[PDB]
Amino acid sequence: NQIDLNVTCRYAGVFHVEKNGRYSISRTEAADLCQAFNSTLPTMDQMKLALSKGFETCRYGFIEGNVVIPRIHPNAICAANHTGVYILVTSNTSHYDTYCFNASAPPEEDCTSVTDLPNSFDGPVTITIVNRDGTRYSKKGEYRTHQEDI
Ligand SMILES: OC1CCN(Cc2ccsc2)CC1
Numbered sequence: 001n002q003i004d005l006n007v008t009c010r011y012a013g014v015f016h017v018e019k020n021g022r023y024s025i026s027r028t029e030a031a032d033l034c035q036a037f038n039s040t041l042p043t044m045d046q047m048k049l050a051l052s053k054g055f056e057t058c059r060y061g062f063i064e065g066n067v068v069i070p071r072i073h074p075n076a077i078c079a080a081n082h083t084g085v086y087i088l089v090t091s092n093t094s095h096y097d098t099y100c101f102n103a104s105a106p107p108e109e110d111c112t113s114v115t116d117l118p119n120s121f122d123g124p125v126t127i128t129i130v131n132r133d134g135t136r137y138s139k140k141g142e143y144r145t146h147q148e149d150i
Contacts, residue, residue: 001124001125001126002125002126002127002128003019003020003125003126003127003128004019004020004021004128004130005017005018005019005033005117005127005128005129005130006018006019006021006130006131006132007114007129007130007131007132008055008057008132009055009109009110009111009132010102010105010106010109010110011050011051011053011054011055011108011109011110012046012049012050012052012053012055012105012107012108013039013046013050013101013102013103013104013105013106013107014042014046014047014049014050014055014099014100014101015099015100015101015102015105015114016057016059016061016097016098016099017033017034017037017061017097017098017099017100018059018097019033019097023059023060023093023095023096023097024095025061025062025095025096025097025098026094026095026146026148026149027062027094028145028146028148028149029098029144029146029149030061030062030096030098032143032144032145032146032149033098033100033143033144034098034100034101035119035143036117036118036119036120036121036143037100037102037114037117037118037119038102038104038118038119039100039101039102039103040064040100040101041062041063041064041098041099041100041101042063042064042099042100042101043063043064043101044063044064044065044066044068044085046063046101047063047068047070047085047099048084048085050070051070051071051072051084051085053107053108053109054072054108054109055070055072056070056071056072056073057069057070058075058077058078058079059096059097060088060096060097061096061097061098061099062096062097062098062099063099066087066088067087067088067091067096068085068086068087068088068099069085069086069088070084070085070086071083071084071085071086113131113133113135114129114131114137115129115135115137116129116137117129117137117139117141117143120139120141120142120143121141121142121143122141122142123140123141123142123143124140124142125140125141125142126138126139126140127139127140127141127143
């Protein structure tokens with residue numbers, strides 16, 4: 001019973017989380033997941049400030065109110081070559097990655113690794129945080145509060 005959470009650098013407190021190497025997070029699960037990192041879904045303003053500090057991904061993820069991809073450099077297979085916070089407009093489907101915002105993180109680029117899941121609760125799942133440099137932190141617990149997300 002295992003969940004892998006791949007996480008990025010934080011930029012003005014904003015970071016990306018991909019679950020189990022595939023788009024697999026619902027909007028309700030995303031809020032609960034960020035809560036386990038003492039974080040919240042970023043506002044569009046928080047995400048724009050993270051972008052300005054160097055944040056970009058090539059994956060759709062929730063923020064408050066929308067699903068987006070932050071882009072700095074144009075790439076034809078990432079958000080159809082757009083730059084800025086690209087907003088998903090049309091999709092049949094509901095599951096994506098998530099972004100999270102930690103207000104206590106550093107103000108600019110923080111590419112140190114993540115070594116804790118501070119606000120998960122008691123549960124049976126082995127949750128493993130996987131950093132980009134491969135370092136891992138694991139703990140037994142749960143973060144999902146909605147039964148339909150389990
Ligand atoms: O009230 C709930 C809190 C979270 N737990 C999770 C769990 C499932 C098997 S063991 C622990 C269940 C009861």
